[PDB]
Amino acid sequence: MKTLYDLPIVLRNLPEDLVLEKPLPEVSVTIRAYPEILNNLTKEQISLWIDATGKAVGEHTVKIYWQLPAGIEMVSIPDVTYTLKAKEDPLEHHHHHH
């Protein structure tokens, strides 16, 4: 009933001039905490995003600045790896004629 698939992962500071060939691959995470807060805590309370600023074109591994408003610790993993490419401008502009 869709095709966009924005995924819970949101990208901040995304320079238009650059575009992602494919959406961020989904991956599982492992957390360690009490069941009372885990059974009460919701996904909407979890802040997950990535900073494309400073970063340049190409594939690189980066950490997720995860944030939890409680007494929860991060077990380990996961890492993200993708391929950033330049916008395929169809309107053409650079290089006088071709």
Side-chain angles (χ1 to χ4, degrees):
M1 300 294 187
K2 60 188 299 196
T3 171
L4 307 177
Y5 291 108
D6 185 66
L7 310 178
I9 313 306
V10 69
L11 214 184
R12 184 173 296 180
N13 198 318
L14 171 48
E16 59 192 313
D17 184 49
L18 309 181
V19 296
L20 251 159
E21 54 177 37
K22 269 177 63 160
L24 307 179
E26 186 178 17
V27 60
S28 300
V29 314
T30 315
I31 298 301
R32 194 87 186 181
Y34 286 92
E36 78 195 288
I37 60 180
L38 283 164
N39 184 37
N40 188 37
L41 183 58
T42 169
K43 282 59 171 179
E44 302 181 63
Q45 273 182 267
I46 318 305
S47 191
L48 288 154
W49 75 100
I50 320 180
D51 60 316
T53 193
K55 277 69 181 178
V57 191
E59 56 181 325
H60 187 238
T61 306
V62 293
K63 298 181 180 179
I64 317 307
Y65 299 88
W66 100 121
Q67 296 181 1
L68 310 173
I72 299 171
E73 297 180 6
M74 194 210 290
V75 178
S76 179
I77 94 170
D79 32 292
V80 295
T81 313
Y82 53 86
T83 308
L84 188 60
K85 295 181 180 301
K87 175 62 176 180
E88 191 180 81
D89 302 280
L91 308 178
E92 189 66 26
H93 185 274
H94 59 329
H95 306 136
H96 57 287
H97 186 256
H98 183 73

